[PDB]
Design a protein around this ligand. Structure first.
Ligand SMILES: O=C[C@H](O)[C@@H](O)[C@H](O)[C@H](O)CO
Ligand SMILES: O=C[C@H](O)[C@@H](O)[C@H](O)[C@H](O)CO
Ligand SMILES: O=C[C@H](O)[C@@H](O)[C@H](O)[C@H](O)CO
Ligand SMILES: O=C[C@H](O)[C@@H](O)[C@H](O)[C@H](O)CO
Ligand code: NI
Ligand code: NI
Ligand code: NI
Ligand code: NI
Ligand code: NI
Ligand code: NI
Ligand code: NI
Ligand code: NI
Ligand code: NI
Ligand code: NI
Ligand code: NI
Ligand code: NI
Lengths: 388, 388, 388, 388
């Protein structure tokens, strides 16, 4: 058995992932900066499909228009030389001190206007490079204290910002869609739109909701102790899973951004099972950080491992679903009945149906076991490659 | 200073709260059952406005229609004797073994039909008793293992159930609205619609979304480490805060249902500040459990304490907002600017505004402190009654 | 490959595990009670080595001495018929309402004396049945509120209790040792001695510390977000791992007591690697609850799964450690150097060693990568059976 | 009422607290560096008693011996000019890349020797400046992955390091004691000795345990969801609370290091009640970070707020304990009985006492309420200044 990725697998990486220098709240960088061109070349050799970027990853903050041109031309030549694509781009609205209280929901109105202009400039670049999805992660939108932020006013400002961006894209005729990335905390004590559900709910209040979806991240939902596969199922159900960020997280703590497959391994299995069975056709993007213990050889090993673990889990989930014994166990647990309508006969027939209440034998129904443990141990056996 | 509740304060309690007998996963009951009539009389003496119930709290499961009538008539006489109201009712779809895999999203179709009929029977009773809000808490909707529940099918079943209930209420001409109560886990390993955001998002996919809102509970959002006042602000912003359950919780662990004001005290302060400043006019319902250490005197003390703590926090939040020094601090932290539109001049003027980008002095903007710590210490001083 | 347990594998189960009837805080029992004799017979057929019990699991609370004798004689005949052993016993100091504020640290002195007498009666029974370890889980020792419990006085009472029990065992000449089981919360809002570390520290203050060790449980340390294998390593290092409770837990929430291998699968792998490589020779006891969704066939499937998952992980950890490629990776990550003393040359030589400071090349040392990601992906490949 | 600190209150601050420049994992510094001399002068004006430092806070890493002398002389003159003391010092073994896998438990032996020499050099400086306590926070001791660190070998290395430091202090004749600061995670995925209990247990295995205690931090124990006042009570009980770090934390997430009194306010109240009633006489040290939203005026406001909140809580806890109504409630809840020995009559008398078992009326005992809710609402009323 081998597990070699190809560009057809649609694995993508942000420049800032393999390029993370290892600075953390208590420590200096342990690695030198990587030239974006170098990252594109090394990722292509590993079998990746493409790369993503923030404006400031590619073009140093404050660059002159002439240096901006220079940086883009070099990057484009690396893309041309390798066949790598750029399916997604995003804005850095979190590193510079001016964004210390947010971009779109900063209390200072002049900062909010700057945040919008900085974003618009980079959407134009994203379209030129062929990106299909524009992600927004409002990492500084939030608060450490209750009085600092009126959240209803902040949501008004957030909606105003996304509605303006939607007006821009539509007036320019661009074919690009937005994806909001929720995170519950870090770096702010609480971040607005903290989970996939809060982001989905907010989108329905935008003027053109069809332009907006979610970009959920494995470790972010897990920082609130939530079930990531469940949240992804709700996003799919809503038609809003436009992009996804894959990584690993060990529980409720700071966001670790481990390589995919690390952290909660069984959650990773059920996530791959769901993406592949739902036909998700977007990029499989890794937003991870090679630990600062590693040198560059460990960076590339960690990146390769992201893709390897996806492909092992894909094989195991497919084997699980194709196993006749598992298909019989699913019927034993009545997953087939869950897919059937409760009352396609309609309200009135339900009200007239004595077998649904007057003559329903509750004790007999209650005695039926669900057979979930046998089903879950077949899933475990498939994940560990222990079938016999 | 005293803090005496009156029925005008709209404090309400579920029968199951003060009536909790103290059974927990590791222990037997420590208190005898309370007759509902006794609870209504004692709560009225404490100054409560009304009570709420599950079907099975008032009418013992499996009761004959003749005993059902008897139980309702006794309850109604206690309401008439005390002036207590019944603003909300709900269904027990979680205690009986038949609901072990859920009510509306049980894999067994016959159970789902029974769950709907049991619910409909109690909506009719709720309307007769004058309830305005019908809560649904899907405590058994969820899973302990990944294969047991296809969440997209489960969401289809959940939507089908709520759409049928909406058809029923509208065809009967009832003036009642539904409120979905999210909870992330317990008793299932993960529960569907785990937070206020996931519930808000789901409602927008119902056929008649205007009939449905949320009933958030303090401790439930805190079991996912989320900021309850923030989630309530999002519900208010959406127009969907139809009801609220107040209690206390110490962090991420089993749901404790302590009396209101226990658990996270500063969160309780910012919650009351927000409800009172937004003009929330619904019931202030306490869904709490007097600890099983207590006898009945401690039950009534714990219930009184719920109301007392609300009224102390209400006084402190009002004093905070009325203090001229705090009003000046809010302007210093630019909360006034947060309430102003970012770009009422419109997209095109924003794009043409050189002061928003080309000539924006980012360093000067970044140097301005937000003054949030001085503001937060004024809030602390007001909460502790330490102003001078 | 198969994974058949035998009594030589030392797998043991509490009567209360497979016998759990499915009562939870929000629901009635879903299964009938099991006769202890039936459980012993079914577990022996599955390949278990033995069973454990609380006093009240075997002998109904309040039984007459004549009924006590009857229950023990029946149990003993089932042990004789099956070859099953009883390596551990414990006391129920948590279910009866009299223990609502604790057993050994209840505020009421008469309750504390009763708790000690109830415990002593069952140690005598435990020795008669051949138990080697006596577990104490102080599930009701703790508080919901700060004023209810002076923790220094409570620790005095806890120490007094364990010192008396040590005096009893030694004066009777019994060969039995005690194991304290920590848990951070549930059913009390905070429980005393909440983690393995707090229990280890407390033992060192007992009069005869050599008689006391720890009985850590996978899900309990994980309810505080701690690394269970790390805590077990500290207990081994201290010589205090007398017993262990195996199960699974999905993060920080109520204690789920899933079957072993469920919950955090990678933690389960590193736990088995450590127990087997340290030569832990005590029972592998499962303290788990078959989910209340299951009928008795699912109970036995869940129990079998506990043992199966241990044996799969044992095989994978052994293959990992025996792989020459992994042995080379461990040297590359300098695990061999971690095992060597830092300064066996002594203090004075260290102070005189210029290469340790004056002439130490910090930049060269800092540039060396630790190669941990390659090592961790070999571990992942071994766990998933993906080596090539 | 005012709340003015004086040096007699023993409030102390690390140079790195008010000096934090605002760098976080996602953002650049928002404030310029502070000269240590400036911090000492401003803190003295606010009423602080003293300051603490890491070696590298005072003397820039890699400084020449001549620049080292210069930096110390300037600092000493600021201490002389202000009357400020230096009660505690510590080593930075976490910022430089050479410590990326730890100091005392790094896999590379040469790094471990360097870590010890760097520490010893700073103990000599600490004694010269009059420090009484030397803190060790092993922030890089730990792992992101299971194979990277054999924890038994790591604990051997940790013990070897602390034993060498104890030999050094004793051979030099220094009057200084060590305090180990536990933290469960951040910056490593799991840190060794993650809680107060694990640190206390480890100390008992050192060669000279009397030289070592703990320096617990409010937010660190709360990052594992533990009860900080309870952990402090266990440290006091053991005689090991040598120092304490005060700050605030909102639950289980990244360590926020908010000002003291922020985060869990009721926990702060019970902490002050316990320190003051136990007679803790060491420094009240604040290890906090003024949020990066603030300018220098907000830094000093945040620092002042630390001290103010301690003094308000001290007043409220004292009023609580002195209130005759609270003293009566404590007797009603039998706190007086908790302080009495369970069995000072001895084992044999307990075994012969029929009232402790044979004739103990369990039902009567179980019916007695503990009256904890009335007690807790008196505590709440005192905290909020609502007594009447
Ligand atoms: O923790 C933060 C986020 O995961 C971040 O990396 C976003 O993914 C990226 O900035 C948005 O495009
Ligand atoms: O933990 C559970 C819920 O809080 C529950 O009490 C709901 O509030 C009530 O059953 C719905 O009406
Ligand atoms: O959650 C609780 C504990 O795990 C419990 O089952 C103890 O293991 C047993 O009662 C002690 O012997
Ligand atoms: O999060 C980290 C710690 O709290 C740290 O500040 C220690 O207190 C100090 O470095 C030890 O002296
Ligand atoms: Ni992220
Ligand atoms: Ni992340
Ligand atoms: Ni991301
Ligand atoms: Ni609840
Ligand atoms: Ni609750
Ligand atoms: Ni509720
Ligand atoms: Ni347990
Ligand atoms: Ni457990
Ligand atoms: Ni256990
Ligand atoms: Ni800290
Ligand atoms: Ni901290
Ligand atoms: Ni600290």
């Amino acid at each position: 058995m081998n597990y070699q990725p190809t560009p057809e697998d649609r694995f993508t990486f942000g420049l800032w992932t393999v390029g993370w220098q290892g600075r953390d709240p208590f420590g200096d960088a342990t690695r030198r900066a990587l030239d974006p061109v170098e990252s594109v070349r090394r990722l292509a050799e590993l079998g990746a499909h493409g790369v993503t970027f923030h404006d400031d990853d590619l073009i140093p903050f404050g660059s002159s228009d002439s240096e901006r041109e220079e940086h883009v031309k070099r990057f484009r030549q690396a893309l041309d030389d390798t066949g790598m694509k750029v399916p997604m781009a995003t804005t850095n609205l979190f590193t510079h001190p001016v964004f210390k209280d947010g971009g779109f929901t900063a209390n200072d109105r002049d900062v909010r206007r700057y945040a919008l202009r900085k974003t618009i400039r980079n959407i134009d670049l994203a379209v030129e490079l062929g990106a299909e999805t524009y992600v927004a992660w409002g990492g500084r939108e939030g608060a450490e204290s209750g009085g600092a932020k009126d959240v209803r006013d902040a949501l008004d400002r957030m909606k105003e910002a996304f509605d303006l961006l939607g007006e821009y894209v539509t007036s320019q005729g661009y074919d690009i869609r937005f994806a909001i990335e929720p995170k519950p905390n870090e770096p702010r004590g609480d971040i607005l739109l903290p989970t996939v559900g809060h982001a989905l709910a907010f989108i329905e209040r935008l003027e053109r909701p069809e332009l907006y979806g979610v970009n959920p991240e494995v470790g972010h939902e897990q920082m609130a102790g939530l079930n990531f596969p469940h949240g992804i199922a709700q996003a799919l159900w809503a038609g809003k899973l436009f992009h996804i960020d894959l990584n690993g997280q060990n529980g409720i703590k700071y966001d670790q951004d481990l390589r995919f497959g690390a952290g909660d391994l069984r959650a990773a299995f059920w996530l791959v099972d769901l993406l592949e069975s739902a036909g998700y056709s977007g990029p499989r993007h890794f937003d991870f950080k090679p630990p600062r213990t590693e040198d560059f050889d460990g960076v590339w090993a960690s990146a390769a491992g992201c893709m390897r673990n996806y492909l092992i889990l894909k094989e195991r989930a497919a084997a699980f679903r194709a196993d006749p014994e598992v298909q019989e166990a699913l019927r034993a647990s009545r997953l087939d009945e869950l897919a059937r309508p409760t009352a396609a006969d309609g309200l009135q027939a339900l009200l007239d149906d004595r077998s649904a209440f007057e003559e329903f034998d509750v004790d007999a129904a209650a005695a039926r076991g669900m057979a979930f443990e046998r089903l879950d141990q077949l899933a475990m056996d498939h994940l560990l490659g222990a079938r016999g």
